[PDB]
């Protein structure tokens, strides 16, 4: 049985090798990309947006702001939003149609 098993395992030993060495690859190519997706999203910020004052945040990654236009919406907050700095009503950068907190 061995000459079929004891020998058919060496493959396995390589499977962990084929993948053990490749696995590090995803860890490695992800981190470089990790900086991409974060930067690529920068467009979300743009430049000609509509300032708003912060109101309240339903919870994680959400809140209700005020629009200078008078709108007041439940909007979404970019992962970047160095939160800590979100008192109770901030003048705030608003995406226009994505309409969310920049």
Partner 1 sequence: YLSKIEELQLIVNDKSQNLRRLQAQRNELNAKVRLLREELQLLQEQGSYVGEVVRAMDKKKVLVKVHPEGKFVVDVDKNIDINDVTPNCRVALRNDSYTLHKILPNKVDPLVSLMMVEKVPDSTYEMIGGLDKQIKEIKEVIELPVKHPEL
Partner 2 sequence: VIDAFRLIQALIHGLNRHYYSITINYRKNELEQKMLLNLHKKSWMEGLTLQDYSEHCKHNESVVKEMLELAKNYNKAVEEEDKMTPEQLAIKNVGKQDPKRHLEEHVDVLMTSNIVQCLAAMLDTVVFK
User: Interface with partner 2 by CB under 8 A: which residues?
Assistant: 43, 57, 59-60, 63, 83-88
d(CA 82, CA 33): 21
Is residue 80 within 8 Å of residue 102, measured between CB atoms? no
Min separation Cβ 62 and partner 2, Å? 9
* Count of chain residues binding partner 1 (CB under 8 A): 40
Interface of this chain with partner 1, residues 8 to 27, rule: CB under 8 A: 9-10, 12-13, 16, 19-20, 23-24, 26-27
Closest contact distance (angstroms) between CB of 102 and partner 2 is: 16
Q: Does 86 bind partner 1 (CB under 8 A)?
A: no
- Residue 63's beta-bridge partner residues? 75
- Cα–Cα distance between 14 and 7 in angstroms, integer? 12
Smallest distance, partner 2 to C-beta of residue 43, A: 7
Question: Which long-range contacts link 33-39 to residues 24+ away (Cβ below 8 Å)?
Answer: 38/80
């Amino acid at each position: 049985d061995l000459y079929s098993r004891y020998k058919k395992l060496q493959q396995e030993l390589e499977f962990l090798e084929v993948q053990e060495e490749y696995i590090k690859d995803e860890q490695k190519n992800l981190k470089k990309e990790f900086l991409h997706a974060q930067e690529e999203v920068k467009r979300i910020q743009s430049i000609p947006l509509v300032i708003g004052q912060f109101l309240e945040a339903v919870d994680q990654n959400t809140a209700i702001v005020g629009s200078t236009t008078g709108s007041n919406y439940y909007v979404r907050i970019l992962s970047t939003i160095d939160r800590e700095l979100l008192k109770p009503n901030a003048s705030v950068a608003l995406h226009k149609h994505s309409n969310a907190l920049v």
